[PDB]
Amino acid sequence: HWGYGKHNGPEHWHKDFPIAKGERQSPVDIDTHTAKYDPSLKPLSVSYDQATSLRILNNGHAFNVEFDDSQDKAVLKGGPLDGTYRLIQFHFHWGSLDGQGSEHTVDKKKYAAELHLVHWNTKYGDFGKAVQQPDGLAVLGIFLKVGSAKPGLQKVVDVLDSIKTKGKSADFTNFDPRGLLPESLDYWTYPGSLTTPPLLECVTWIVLKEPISVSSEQVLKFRKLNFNGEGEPEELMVDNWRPAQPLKNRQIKASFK
Ligand SMILES: [Zn+2]
Numbered sequence: 001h002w003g004y005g006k007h008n009g010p011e012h013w014h015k016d017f018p019i020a021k022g023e024r025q026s027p028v029d030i031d032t033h034t035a036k037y038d039p040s041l042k043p044l045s046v047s048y049d050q051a052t053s054l055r056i057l058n059n060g061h062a063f064n065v066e067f068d069d070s071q072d073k074a075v076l077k078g079g080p081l082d083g084t085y086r087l088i089q090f091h092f093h094w095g096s097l098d099g100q101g102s103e104h105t106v107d108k109k110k111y112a113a114e115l116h117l118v119h120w121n122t123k124y125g126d127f128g129k130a131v132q133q134p135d136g137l138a139v140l141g142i143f144l145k146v147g148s149a150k151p152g153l154q155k156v157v158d159v160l161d162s163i164k165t166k167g168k169s170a171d172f173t174n175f176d177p178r179g180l181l182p183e184s185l186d187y188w189t190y191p192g193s194l195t196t197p198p199l200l201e202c203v204t205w206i207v208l209k210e211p212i213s214v215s216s217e218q219v220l221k222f223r224k225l226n227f228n229g230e231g232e233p234e235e236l237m238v239d240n241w242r243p244a245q246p247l248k249n250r251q252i253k254a255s256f257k
Contacts, residue, residue, distance in 0.1 A: 051068075144212055
């Protein structure tokens, strides 16, 4: 099945998901000098105050924190978006070394990790129908830099031991995702895809300019997770990032001068 190793990694994905070679694939490198100020972009509207987190799951290539998406409780609007999108999950991708890990790059600079907050367009009724639509998903991408610890990440860090191996899940209530946001909400935006199978081209990407810092010891605990299931041989969960894909016929717009 697909993964991130030598024999089943991103260079092999096209064999089972030919959209891997499509026209609007993600991630991409963000060339800050050719991105375009768009003054018609509205500011982002992030409303996470009523968010209801449910649980945390090792799914064998990352770890997801899931949310109640049966009602408008944690929503994203504004920006380049038309309509309301509900938060369904967030996850991270990260590297084996501090100098790699992010999926998007900025002027070919790699960050230590990226946070992806996945939202779907309520217009379409359920998440399964949203992913079939050009404007079905909106993912908010946030870069992580190694520096001072991020307090609001620590509750995620401390539960990771209970979901070491693939398939394990733990109750994870009352987590507030506002602790993960940077100070500024300036961003770049472009149309893209999921970065993992099935790589559907259904995503409006919103990548924040400002990284958040986490400590060396927080990201170490990410790296002690396990791709394998319990009882299987131990593969450390690291380098679960897809390399940048050609921009082709797309333009990256910025919300800031
Ligand atoms: Zn992701």
